[PDB]
Symmetry: C3
């Protein structure tokens, strides 16, 4: 097994890694709308969702995975009313490949993020 680290996603600040590879599977940590330099994006819900996906792309690629090998995602959202907007952005990344998914509204996310996504992906 091994930890995944990339400078193209926010640094894992604390007792966790950006992700872990075990067997041929990559488990990401949940990604929020932080830039790699570590500050929150302050545009709309769609801009925040794009940043989450930028971070996911970076950790996936460092792990030898891609969006096309994601098997399962969990989407934590701050407001279920914003689901349609999050889903529009989400579908640009999972276009022809469509992972299993669950989406729920939590009480609160780290740094009061509007969206947080974790993924599990195959490493070919």
């Amino acid at each position: 097994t091994k930890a995944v680290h990339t400078k193209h996603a926010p640094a894992a600040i604390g007792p966790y890694s950006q992700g872990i590879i075990v067997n041929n599977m990559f488990y990401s940590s949940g990604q929020i709308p932080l830039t790699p330099s570590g500050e929150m994006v302050n545009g709309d819900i769609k801009e925040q969702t794009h940043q989450v996906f930028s971070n996911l792309k970076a950790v996936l690629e460092e792990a030898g995975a891609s969006f096309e090998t994601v098997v399962k995602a969990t989407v934590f959202i701050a407001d279920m009313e914003q689901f349609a907007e999050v889903n529009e952005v989400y579908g640009q990344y999972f276009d022809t490949h469509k992972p299993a998914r669950s989406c729920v509204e939590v009480a609160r996310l780290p740094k009061d993020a509007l969206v947080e996504i974790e993924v599990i992906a195959l490493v070919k």
Copy 2:
């Protein structure tokens, strides 16, 4: 990797699949009390939980899995006060085979569902 499709659960409309088979494992999307035709069930919490399990049964069986091969479930519930009733139905399906589980009360679910359950299962 293979997407799972069955007409006996609500259609995956949008950028996700009802479930995914990877290696010898099956990951479901979270199922809610939605009929295959796309109507929310408006009976009591037990009738609604039964619909969630009907949906899970359909996707599991299409994947070549069963309740008997489920290893992990996550139960997201709208109100923990209703968990005992959800658990009564849950325990009819997982009676002698007993998966790992985590259960939490969320702020809100898709379509304001009262409960959502996702599973991971072995494909023998």
Copy 3:
């Protein structure tokens, strides 16, 4: 595949197991701050989190896993304002190994627990 049973964590009471081994992987149930005798732990969030980790230690070791082989954790917290305290204790057990994780504030946990933690680990 095998259900995991240990007397050194609270008993799984009902239609679930403390964890499940499948292939070479271990899935825990979410652990809350109950003692093995079934009483909620006395004291502050740090004391509660220590109990959660004692429980995780017990189920991991019974499964032939350890904190060193945990690949992914999820931390469900009642109040994100208490996360610094939870994280301090978390870091004492995940010091030599830093799994992937997600941490979210939920509306409510079983038995009004302040924190619940689940893990997935490799069985060596």
